[PDB]
């Protein structure tokens, strides 16, 4: 107490508005997954912001999928009910998005922060 945040996004990236040409949305536990169904054939990078506590990545604040050119085409966010999630919830929601984008022929990569979070639980 209190918490800090490690993030892959500039302050602009996590504040910017975005919308989906073809809006797809799915609830996975306490988290909302959105991805633009229209996006295809792109190289995508998943970037997250995590609360950091006791030097441990603690909880997902925001995840977004960016194309190589910086466009937001996917989002993972907790429900405003503020239902608290677990690291498995997160890893689960994340694979759902990955699968969603690879359906459309997008090559998906994850950030170093997520690469590390995968194995930290």
Numbering used by the authors: 85 to 205
From the paper:
During infection the influenza A virus NS1 protein participates in multiple protein-RNA and protein-protein interactions to perform a plethora of functions. The N-terminal 73 amino-acid residues of NS1 form a symmetrical homodimeric RNA-binding domain (RBD), which is connected to the central effector domain (ED; residues 86-204) via an inter-domain linker. Present models of the tertiary and quaternary structures of NS1 indicate that the protein possesses two globular domains, each capable of forming independent homodimeric interactions. Our bioinformatic analyses indicate that the N-terminal RBD forms a very stable homodimer, while the predominant and ubiquitous helix-helix contacts between C-terminal EDs bear many similarities with weak transient interfaces.
Previous studies using recombinant Alb/76 and Ud/72 EDs have shown that a single W187A amino-acid substitution is sufficient to prevent dimerization. However, as the strand-strand dimer has never been observed in structures from these strains, it may be that the PR8 ED behaves differently. We therefore introduced the W187A mutation into the PR8 NS1 ED bacterial expression construct. We crystallized the purified PR8 ED-W187A protein and solved the structure by molecular replacement. Two crystal forms were obtained for this protein, both occurring under the same crystallization condition but separated in time. Furthermore, the rationally-designed ‘helix-open’ NS1 protein (W187A) was poor at binding synthetic dsRNA, perhaps indicating that ED helix-helix dimeric interactions allosterically increase affinity of the RBD for dsRNA, or that ED homotypic interactions facilitate oligomerization of NS1 and thus cooperative binding to dsRNA.
